[PDB]
């Protein structure tokens, strides 16, 4: 009987450890009584999808590769290192910070959504949160059929790891579209484009389709369009760029690329085919619509270029793993120009993230709402020290509110701890 290896956070705090209990004769916590060692998760629901839970080796388990075994999450993906022999399992230290993990999970409060917080210059995943969640301690050490069925019958599906699920990125994708337009030469950041009305189309060939916007602006430049959430500006800049210049910039990212993370995840895609085959879809992809499917972990990876002078860093979950990058995904001037203009989302009183304004901290942000019901997104960038990046989403934002409405405790926590 060898002890299973432990999973600890970046500071050594236990994420999946062993603890002896007095159980109520074979094993609730106090027939008979005996001191039995049990697999314990201190963060509970806050890290349930990431860490996973254990279970007994079933018949079909040993029927593949010849008392407890990882059934899901990192407890399953890291089983060979944590199981050991009968040699104690080794301890695997992650990049997670327990303080940030419990902050990101607390802001949702049963709301469906996800949140990832990274170190945009190292790739360290400080937190990967999916809501709603479940009790991993109950699932591993005996859960009743009343709480299991309560989890299965939940229409929001608490078992799914939403940080590894592909969604449409929303208007936050304009940051990439605008940066590609800058390096292409077609998008001048200071030229004033005349945009009139709340709807726009290229010509009569679009028919009953229009690019719609919210706030009416008179001449819209790059900085104003990002703060005003103007779809028409980026649509016109996408049509001006052409399918080739736009796809040339997008292909420098990690689309269709499998990552070395120990989290199962479908690679990000641009569209179903190698070509757009239309022009309304080219405009849609310009402002985050179309057939884009990027996961929160992949979204945090792509957007890391703005805090590394255009260099993309890959996400890492194990601490001692070497930092991997993809150099020159966008220019340094393009990354800095977009990151500087995004300060207006927080600092401008008319900005949509002005509720999080802090005069002693530079925070660039960008909102986004996608129609799939509608989901809300929020990307924030530490421009004071480039030490954290957030990607927060809330599913069914028409009923559960926007991501900005609940993310203020999270952002305030990071600015004081990670700084």
Ligand X SMILES: *C(=O)[C@@H](NC(=O)/C(=N\OCC)c1nsc(N)n1)[C@@H]1NC(C(=O)O)=C(Sc2nc(-c3cc[n+](C)cc3)cs2)CS1
Note the Cα 13 to chain centre separation in Å.
23
> Which residue from 329, 370, 394, 410 is in contact with ligand X, where contact means CB under 6 A?
370
Q: Which residues pair with 261 in a beta bridge?
A: none
CB burial string 217-228: b at 16+ within 10 A, e below = beebbbbbbbbb
The structure tokens 């960038």 sit at 381
Angle in degrees, CA 99, 317, 19, rounded to 5: 60
> Which residue from 113, 178, 286, 368 is in contact with ligand X, where contact means CB under 6 A?
368
Judged by CB under 6 A, which stretch of 67-75, 137-145, 147-155, 363-371 contacts ligand X? 363-371
Task: Quote the least distance from Cβ 171 to ligand X, whole Å.
Answer: 2
The structure tokens 């229409």 sit at 155
Chain residue whose CB lies nearest ligand X: 171
Please give the structure tokens belonging to residue 393.
């989403």
> Which residue from 367, 380, 390, 407 is in contact with ligand X, where contact means CB under 6 A?
367
Beta strand 14-23 with 7-8 is: antiparallel
Chain residues 1-40 in contact with ligand X, contact rule CB under 6 A: none
Residue 288 binds to ligand X (criterion: CB under 6 A):
yes
Choice between 41 and 377, CB closer to ligand X:
377
Note the Cα 253 to chain centre separation in Å.
16
Choice between 9 and 230, CB closer to ligand X:
230
Task: Quote the least distance from Cβ 172 to ligand X, whole Å.
Answer: 7
Residue 229 binds to ligand X (criterion: CB under 6 A):
yes
Choice between 260 and 371, CB closer to ligand X:
371
Please give the structure tokens belonging to residue 55.
């279970």
Q: What does the per-residue mask of binding to ligand X show for 151-170, with x meaning CB under 6 A?
A: -----------------x-x
Judged by CB under 6 A, which stretch of 22-30, 197-205, 303-311, 368-376 contacts ligand X? 368-376
Q: Pick the catalytic residue: 38, 131, 133, 171?
A: 171
Residue 231 binds to ligand X (criterion: CB under 6 A):
yes
171 is catalytic: yes
Tell me how far CA of residue 186 lies from CA of 22, 161, 241, 282, 311, in angstroms: 69, 39, 6, 16, 22
Choice between 158 and 170, CB closer to ligand X:
170
Beta strand 363-371 with 374-382 is: antiparallel
The structure tokens 């008179």 sit at 218
Please give the structure tokens belonging to residue 59.
């018949």
Task: Quote the least distance from Cβ 327 to ligand X, whole Å.
Answer: 29
Is the Cβ–Cβ distance between 409 and 143 less than 8 Å?
no
Judged by CB under 6 A, which stretch of 85-93, 123-131, 271-279, 281-289 contacts ligand X? 281-289
Angle in degrees, CA 242, 279, 248, rounded to 5: 30
Residue 234 binds to ligand X (criterion: CB under 6 A):
no
**Burial tier of 372 (Cβ tally within 10 Å: 0-12, 13-18, 19+):** exposed
Choice between 133 and 404, CB closer to ligand X:
404
Cis peptide before 33 (omega within 30 of 0): no
Chain residues 371-390 in contact with ligand X, contact rule CB under 6 A: 371, 374
Choice between 70 and 170, CB closer to ligand X:
170
Please give the structure tokens belonging to residue 315.
């996400």
Is the Cβ–Cβ distance between 167 and 372 less than 8 Å?
yes
Judged by CB under 6 A, which stretch of 67-75, 130-138, 285-293, 409-417 contacts ligand X? 285-293
Choice between 394 and 410, CB closer to ligand X:
394
Task: Quote the least distance from Cβ 215 to ligand X, whole Å.
Answer: 6
**Looking at beta carbons, which pairs linking 282-285 to residues 24 or more positions away fall under 8 Å?**
282/238, 282/239, 282/243, 282/246, 283/202, 283/211, 283/235, 283/238, 283/239, 285/238, 285/246
Task: Quote the least distance from Cβ 374 to ligand X, whole Å.
Answer: 6
Count CB-CB contacts under 10 A for residue 209. Answer: 14
Choice between 4 and 213, CB closer to ligand X:
213
Please give the structure tokens belonging to residue 94.
């992650």
Task: Quote the least distance from Cβ 177 to ligand X, whole Å.
Answer: 11
Residue 352 binds to ligand X (criterion: CB under 6 A):
yes
Residue numbers at the binding site for ligand X (CB under 6 A)? 168, 170-171, 214, 229, 231, 287-289, 352, 367-371, 374
Catalytic residues: 171
């Amino acid at each position: 009987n060898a002890k299973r290896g432990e999973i600890v956070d970046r500071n050594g705090s236990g994420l999946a450890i062993n603890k002896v209990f007095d159980e109520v004769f074979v094993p609730t916590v106090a027939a008979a009584t005996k001191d039995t060692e049990s697999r314990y998760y201190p963060l509970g629901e806050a890290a349930a999808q990431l860490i996973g839970y254990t279970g007994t080796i079933t018949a079909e388990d040993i029927e593949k590769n010849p008392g407890v075994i990882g059934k899901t999450g990192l407890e399953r993906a890291f089983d060979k290192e944590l199981r050991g022999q009968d040699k104690d399992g080794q301890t695997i230290k992650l990049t997670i910070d327990s303080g940030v993990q419990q902050q990101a999970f607390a802001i949702f409060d049963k709301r469906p959504g996800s949140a990832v917080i990274t170190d945009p210059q190292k790739g360290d995943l400080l937190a990967t949160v999916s809501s709603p969640s479940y009790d991993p301690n109950k699932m591993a050490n005996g859960i009743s059929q009343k709480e299991y069925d309560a989890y299965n019958n939940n229409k929001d599906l608490p078992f799914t790891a939403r940080f590894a699920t592909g969604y449409a990125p929303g208007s936050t994708f304009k940051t990439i579209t605008g940066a590609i337009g800058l390096d292409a030469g077609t998008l001048k950041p200071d030229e004033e484009l005349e945009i009139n009305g709340l709807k726009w189309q290229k010509d009569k060939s679009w028919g009953g389709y229009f690019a719609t916007r919210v706030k009416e602006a008179s001449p819209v430049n790059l900085r104003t369009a990002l703060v005003n959430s103007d779809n028409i500006y980026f649509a016109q800049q996408t049509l001006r760029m052409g399918e080739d210049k736009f796809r040339a910039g997008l292909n420098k990212f990690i689309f269709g690329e499998e990552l070395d993370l120990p989290i199962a995840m479908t690679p990000a895609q641009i569209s179903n085919e190698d070509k757009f085959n239309s022009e309304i879809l080219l405009a849609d992809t310009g402002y985050g619509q179309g057939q884009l499917l990027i996961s929160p972990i992949q979204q945090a990876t792509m957007y890391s270029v703005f805090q590394n002078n255009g260099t993309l860093v890959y996400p890492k979950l194990v601490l001692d793993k070497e930092t991997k990058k993809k150099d020159n995904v966008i220019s340094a001037n393009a990354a800095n120009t977009i990151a500087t203009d995004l300060l207006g989302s927080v600092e401008d009183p008319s900005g949509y993230v002005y509720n999080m304004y802090n005069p002693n901290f530079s925070l660039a942000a960008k909102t986004g709402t996608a129609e799939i019901k509608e989901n809300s997104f929020l990307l924030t960038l530490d421009r004071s020290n480039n030490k954290f990046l957030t990607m927060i989403m809330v599913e069914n934002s028409g009923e559960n509110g926007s991501a900005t409405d609940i993310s203020k405790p999270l952002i305030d926590y990071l600015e004081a701890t990670i700084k």
